[PDB]
Design a protein around this ligand. Structure first.
Ligand SMILES: OC[C@H]1O[C@H](O[C@H]2O[C@H](CO)[C@@H](O)[C@H](O)[C@H]2O)[C@H](O)[C@@H](O)[C@@H]1O
Length: 403
């Protein structure tokens, strides 16, 4: 019978790829359908390029793809429209914001699978040790805490200890971290939903100069090559006071044999001042049936299974990844395992989006511009003022004649 082949998630990021393969195998066993899992590189932008090889070829060699929240406007031609396959009631069980994100010129490109938002991880044992009662609310506070805790932990002999780790590598994750910096300084959304390229302003420039000021000071010099897992591994070994990362890191830090098990909490990222907005960049992944799949019916069945209540529950309980079904946020088992899902639900709902809707199919080019200009500030090549002016000019060229 048919072999249903799935490309999604990566065995190089946490347990996501292993868990995904397990879920696809469970569907295959449940339905008596052969399945195969195709692995992917860690970074989302490398995955996009890989999957674009399949799509360009109209390849039938992958039936189901796990696609990033930023991709629908790029990948729509390659997606089977799912709208005819779901009832209005089925579709209402997901967050409407994500269903809307995944709908491009009427085509339901993909079902919401898990959402994501950037959050602050903090070592509560260390905050207590050094006389702090709450995590930092402002970036200045985060810097002051990091400097004091670092000074003490270095003096006590942990030469591997840093104050803050984050994603500073030149790739899509840096666009995520930088949106949070810029937005949390009142510097805007880089490209506004209306199309205005707003990034050339002094608040955005200050945000980027501040992040430069971390590098080699409270954050490792090598932070400029960190993606999610590099940051996580310094954190998880017990070598950072603070980390910016996504929800998946929580379950991994609580696992038996983690050096930091029981020693951390999570909160919203800091912001420049009390009247700036909170920033958490919206992430997450969706499930797309290939337009080139020879087995659309079977593939839609697998996608509905993966997106179901019990598979998303399993994702929440075991991998601390955020459901796209509001009903799961009231599930007693989800909440007992992850109480912080309730505490931060409003942060998740108010997550700020990257400019993928407004840039549409040109988003990847826009983002490459952003992460390269931001990276030039982190590396000390440019000051924030020059980088936001140069970025404005690049994005203007990229989006000229796009509506
Ligand atoms: O939360 C775990 C996921 O982390 C990655 O995806 C997030 O980070 C990306 C940038 O590096 C975003 O574009 C994406 O929207 C976020 O969800 C990783 O690519 C995923 O495989 C992980 O599941």
């Amino acid at each position: 019978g048919p072999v249903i082949r799935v490309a999604g998630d990566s065995t190089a990021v946490g347990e996501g790829g292993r868990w995904m393969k397990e879920m696809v195998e469970a569907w295959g066993k449940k339905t008596g359908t052969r399945v195969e899992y195709i692995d992917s590189p860690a970074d989302t932008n490398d995955r996009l390029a890989l999957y674009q090889q399949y799509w360009a070829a109209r390849s039938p060699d992958v039936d189901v793809y796990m696609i990033d929240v930023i991709w629908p406007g790029i990948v729509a031609p390659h997606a089977l429209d799912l709208k005819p396959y779901l009832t209005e009631a089925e579709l209402k069980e997901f967050f409407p914001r994500i269903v809307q994100n995944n709908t491009i010129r009427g085509k339901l490109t993909s079902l919401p699978f898990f959402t994501d938002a950037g959050i602050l991880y903090y070592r509560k044992d260390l905050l207590e040790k050094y006389g702090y009662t709450s995590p930092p609310r402002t970036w200045n506070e985060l810097e002051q805490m990091a400097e004091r805790v670092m000074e003490g932990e270095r003096r006590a002999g942990n030469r591997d200890f840093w104050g803050f780790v984050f994603q500073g590598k030149p790739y899509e994750g840096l666009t995520c971290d930088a949106l949070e910096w810029i937005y949390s300084h009142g510097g805007g959304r880089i490209v506004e939903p209306d199309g205005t390229i707003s990034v050339n302003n002094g608040r955005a420039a200050l945000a980027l100069n501040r992040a430069h000021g971390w590098v080699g000071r409270i954050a490792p010099q090598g932070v400029t090559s960190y993606a999610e897992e590099e940051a996580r591994n310094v954190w998880q070994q017990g070598n950072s006071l603070f980390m910016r990362n996504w929800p998946y890191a929580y379950a991994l830090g609580q696992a038996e044999g983690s050096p930091i098990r029981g020693k951390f909490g999570v909160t919203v990222l800091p912001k420049a001042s009390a009247d700036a907005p909170n920033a958490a960049t919206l992430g997450g992944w969706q499930l797309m049936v290939s337009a080139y799949s020879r087995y659309p019916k079977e593939a839609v069945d697998l996608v509905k299974y993966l997106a179901s209540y019990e598979v998303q529950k399993d994702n929440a309980v075991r991998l601390s990844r955020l459901p796209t079904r509001p009903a799961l946020y009231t599930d007693r088992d989800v909440l007992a395992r992850n109480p912080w899902f309730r505490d931060l639900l409003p942060v998740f709902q108010n997550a700020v989006s990257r400019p993928s809707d407004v840039a549409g199919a040109r988003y990847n080019q826009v983002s490459e511009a952003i992460w390269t200009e931001v990276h030039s500030v982190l590396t000390g090549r440019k000051k924030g003022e020059q980088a936001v002016r140069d970025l404005e000019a690049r994005i203007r060229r990229i989006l000229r004649h796009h509506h």
